[model samples]
Target: AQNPNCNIMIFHPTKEEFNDFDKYIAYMESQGAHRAGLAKIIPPKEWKARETYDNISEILIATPLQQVASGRAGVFTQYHKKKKAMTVGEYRHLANSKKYQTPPHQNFEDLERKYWKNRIYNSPIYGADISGSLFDENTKQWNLGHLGTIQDLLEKECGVVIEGVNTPYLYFGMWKTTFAWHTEDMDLYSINYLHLGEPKTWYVVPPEHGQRLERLARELFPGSSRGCGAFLRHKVALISPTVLKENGIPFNRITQEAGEFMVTFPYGYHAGFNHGFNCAEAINFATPRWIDYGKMASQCSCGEARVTFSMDAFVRILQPERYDLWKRGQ
Candidate 1:
């Protein structure tokens, strides 16, 4: 049987509502949306993307599937595979080309399927500081860096410029290209905007069942779980939804389309594959509610030791004065 679709909230916001990101997301949180582990936001039709990536040339590295797909014992224990690369434009051509054949094999269609099934690449470009590559002064309001609730707070409060947590990373995806099961660093929330192209399929476990999911992963690969509880952060493990459901794990899947936003909550485990060629920009952000969860992740051995910034430092030392004011306001 198939896995159930996530009861993910979908928001269609007008220009004013969409541009004012903090207000709308605060409203979403108030409506009990956070329990779902994810939500989708669609802007009005008139809203056009201000970013472009097709002309940018960079190395697109191949992602091997045999290691993860086979699910052999200790296969994902330590990911040390040597990867080859090509220019993003060249890979784009290869992704669309019908002339390409794998190992010069049998029926062309079968060979084409095999080619895609075995080979996929992603050009994940960390486009420097937040305002550098994608935005200008006029477009700052629309920047992913500026849109989140507390990313700016991390900057203004703790003086940290964490990449991929506060700064956005642009990603290029082709058919079957996958991001393996993982949670964001420090259990912070993440927001991914599909800049353009085909829809992406996402499967996620809610925050409440996150530990259950981890337990299942450990059971499936005891070799990988022996020393590292945060091995999923290594992003080498991928369990199919059928397996998850069969083992009594709750999972929800969704299709994230162009001009849409996917918000992943704290402690939620999410994984997905691209439908076809696409471009997306994503970053991690935190709200006040995430502080306790962040503390748990930062202090626990089962979670990542390398935090983007110290939550204790932010709460105890850096922001105590402002925290007093915030508490007074509350």
Candidate 2:
């Protein structure tokens, strides 16, 4: 329904995307994967792909970050507890319980089909699943740039200040284990770096075009819809660019080898698969643009048709402090 005048924009980063954080500061408002240095976050130097997955995974999972009161609000270490069923009726029965009611969809039967279709969140992933922040509270990273990160400001604004399982969850992806097509939790911007891994390919839909695919996902899987989200969880179903072309969706792709980084815009819908064994770290942040998109992400009931932010100049002028919190995080 949209024409070229309203077509999504693509930056096509210069091969050496950015050399330093200063360079990145200019483009974080508009960027993709680049041969950039550690922009802001820290990565394990001397790229090493691990002689064996278990060997490296064993050491890092053991790296202790300050253990906060555990996972999502009041609860600790959020995990999936599922009961596999053979029939739709049985699946519905199990899905209705405390096991699976949010994502994939709200209907018990619909979620079951999605679960069976793609064993998502069903894999047994032991070891550490804590926040991936490699710094001490005394580090400049904590006060200077981290102050404006996505999660911190939310707590500050709401005045309910306590956190667990922080943003930028460190991931140790095994072959074929992927995060299926989905935006970040809460429509936040995310950056992923391959601390050490073979390679991972990303299929990104720009914010402008994110809704196009979102509508497609929901329509294709009407059953899996609810307090969850506006997108669908396909088994790498929309991985091909040519396929999206045939379907009239505009998107792009990037293959992140070791020592590389990838960033997704606030509401950009992205999905990818691990080439082989890999360990990656990712975190979220907010800028002036996020103030508006944050509201639309939750308020827009019909597929977040308006997740694009037009730069909240008014927000900054009226509430510079609101933007300051995240500005520090930047």
Candidate 3:
């Protein structure tokens, strides 16, 4: 979508065959795609398009320092535990399990109870399907606990030095139940590479228009209603290639391949729509680390919401002694 505030870049591959899928997967793997987990598209394409499809040549991944900058006991514990590596399904299941439930609805507290019941282990923070996995370990100053840690891991383990720490929130996986449109708070940035299937359409809006669109979304959807506001608003942007351009909303679409596009959203309003799909997998990194107020704003803008603090902060907020043990790496 055309917005006064977003930048879009398209990377089309020269090769366009089903076999090329294998090569791409292999290439990504050799290039450290595995660190992010296998890039699997949902609802595999039944047939190849008659038209030539562009292939993705190279994707440069970025990590923000703020989100992952400080290491915590809980964060460290979770980070190390995840390094062992598990299948997407396995990771999803574990992250959703009851063991990791937090409170403070992303939107209004009452709405959190109304919509989200925390039934599914892998549900989103608002009880949606957006489940997240955590990796934290002690005794390791250098760990993949947060965005900074993730960037460090990429540099040390994957040999990719990150250029920018745009946004600093590392998200493992997310399941989209409905259309999400809204910009985030703070000067956040992101680069989303689709490790799964393609989304149908995406729209980016400039900062000036962000408030108006968000108001419209709230007016239309209201309390956790779907398809109301901008999906995300932040500093930088990263997305898929399958986004289609739409007239109503100045949005873009990638018809040939899965939705994969990189965007630089400077206080822009961006939204996403799935083509009646169930699960959408993406890794999100946000900067300035969301504060309590910002997290609340994100929830109120759209559907249900949830946010977790640094492991150390969480422990201190809950149990100081236990947190100390974790800090000791014992």
Candidate 4:
């Protein structure tokens, strides 16, 4: 009956160790953290803090509400309310409402509280101009638009700018606000930082268990999976940790508090919920090592949408001179 959180690696990098993002990631990869699909990084308190220009507290944003019955009962068919535009302050007020304790929508057997989750997902806080760049030229600090890490090859080499992939996005969450099981686009790595507020609980399936998780999703939601090859990409399929273990899929749970970083490896399937009102920023990144995985994603194993960026184009950029030599040799 125990749900183990031990499989996922957690790192407390020293100031010196954390200084170089590439070095830290290389160390993590060497330790096989990628096999586990994800890892947590708790930055030293002394690390420089990043600043944002916009005041997110009063910013107008859209909050989509998901209606859920307590626990396992409504795991499959979670319904969403029509999204409404509201200031982040208003959403916070609604999230803290006392009505959630015993909401009236309860109607199932063992159904308890029926609560609403306001997930402000993929909201662009900054314009594409700043979000696309890795660093703020003026301040000479890493831009709030991207994860403060070593240069992401997608932006650096590919020169392909995608709003949510190359750009940074803000995500606001309240109790039980969930992001369903799915891999990053093009199987690129994803890095997320919780700026502040309550902790979030994340469940990650190792790279190897990715297929098993997809198979389980197909089994549980036959209707959704029947014609849709990339059903999980819809981000509506929700499964509890218990269900995962019952199907023999290896999973690990982690709690991310304020001032923590979570990194998801290529093809890792992850899903999770928030403990309460909190905000986060995330961005996708890729390195040359990810080229093979990106190629695999382009194959569209079950025929999903093609990759947004061009792998062929990026390949040519990697070694232009070498490409000429290869062409001449051919």
| Whole-model lDDT per candidate | 0.61, 0.44, 0.31, 0.61
**How many clashes in each candidate?**
0, 10, 64, 0
User: CA shift at 181, candidate 1, in angstroms?
Assistant: 0.9
Per-residue alpha-carbon lDDT of model 4 for 6-98, expressed as tens digits? Answer: 267888888778756767887888777888788998887665435553455565565455544222443454445546677777776766667
Q: In model 4, which regions exceed 4 Å deviation? A: 1-6, 51-55, 63-74, 77-80, 100-165, 298-330
lDDT (C-alpha) at residue 105 in model 3: 39
lDDT of 1 at 152: 55
Per-residue lDDT of model 2, residues 133-152, tens digit only:
43233433222224354445
User: Runs in model 3 with CA error above 4 Å?
Assistant: 1-7, 11-177, 185-187, 198-200, 221-256, 259-261, 264-266, 276-281, 286-304, 310-330
Give one digit per residue, the lDDT tens place, for model 3 in 5-103.
333333334334223432543343344322221122222233321222223112111220111111221111000111333344444453345543233
Q: List TM-scores for all candidates, in order.
A: 0.71, 0.52, 0.34, 0.72
- The ten-residue window of minimal lDDT in model 2 covers 66-75
Over 1-330, each residue of candidate 1 has an lDDT whose tens digit, in order, gives 111343677778777777676677787877656767888887777665574555555544343222224443222222334335555576556645553212444543443344334533322221111222333335544467565545455655456653333466666666655677888866788888887665677888878788888988889888767856567765667776657878999878788988788999888889876655666778778776776676565222334333344344444343454445323322
- What is the lDDT for 103 in model 3? 35
